[model samples]
Target: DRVKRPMNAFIVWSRDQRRKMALENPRMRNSEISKQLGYQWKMLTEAEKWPFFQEAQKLQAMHREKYPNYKYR
Candidate 1:
């Protein structure tokens, strides 16, 4: 509920993946990592993507409860 900015599942999952990739491949640059994450995201099926979506929805709900007046412009 205290989260500053909630992210969609793809972004959340991608950030996790990026962190792991960075740890495993220290030589990789931000651009390369982002490109890889985008590629990976594109390759996922809806079934495969469901868990992340669920997690993101939970985060969104929590955020909304914490800040009911917040809205995007």
Candidate 2:
């Protein structure tokens, strides 16, 4: 398995708030997402503080197994 750089959703969501919003909703609090993404508590709250990068296909593939329909498309 080829794990990609920053194989973390917090990092992805951090780069784009819109992506975060997709996962985040009234039922799912942003706070709950940080731990799942292997990030610190504050990181979820300040997702916009992260740097931007391409969405790694490897990371997406890895997560696709767990999240069957995670692909935005």
Candidate 3:
């Protein structure tokens, strides 16, 4: 199995945010979008972070089940 590491909430959110922002602001630079994403991520509370953590945990569980003999590097 080709198990991949699951993204944390911040990473997942940043990816979505990057795509949305890029589409909405075509002229915006990558640095600017990253800066905005950083700001938004820092503003997220534990409550908001919980769902992402849960999703990541679920992904990890699936990965382990699919690749029982695999070991992390």
Candidate 4:
């Protein structure tokens, strides 16, 4: 079985926000939307990002349970 890697804090945030941004703007390209997401993520303060980091940590815990021996190459 292939081990699934856990996402980092920013990725957790971006993954959720990317969908909302796309839903509101159908004409935008993926690359351009990614740039916007990057920009928005940077604009977020620590307080704003804490929830996403919390979610990421939760995922990492579950991932570790499934793949204790897995490591990034």
Preferred candidate (lDDT higher): 2 or 3 = 3
Ranking by TM-score: 4, 1, 3, 2
Give me the runs in candidate 3 sitting further than 4 Å from their true place. Answer: 1-3, 45-54, 64-71
- Per-residue lDDT of model 1, residues 1-73, tens digit only: 3448656676676666667777889796456876776787668656556756766677877778977886564
Cα lDDT, all candidates: 0.69, 0.50, 0.69, 0.69
Cα error, candidate 2, residue 41 (Å): 14
Off by over 4 Å in 4: 1-3, 45-48, 61-73
lDDT of 3 by residue, 12-67 (tens): 76666567776878796456776776777668656656766777777777778988
lDDT per residue (tens digit) for residues 1-73 in model 2: 4433443654555556545545555366557555544554435454333333344655666666776654443
Q: Judge candidate 4 against the unseen true structure and give its global Cα lDDT, from 0 to 1.
A: 0.69
The residue ranges of model 1 lying beyond 4 angstroms of the native Cα positions read: 1-4, 45-52, 64-70
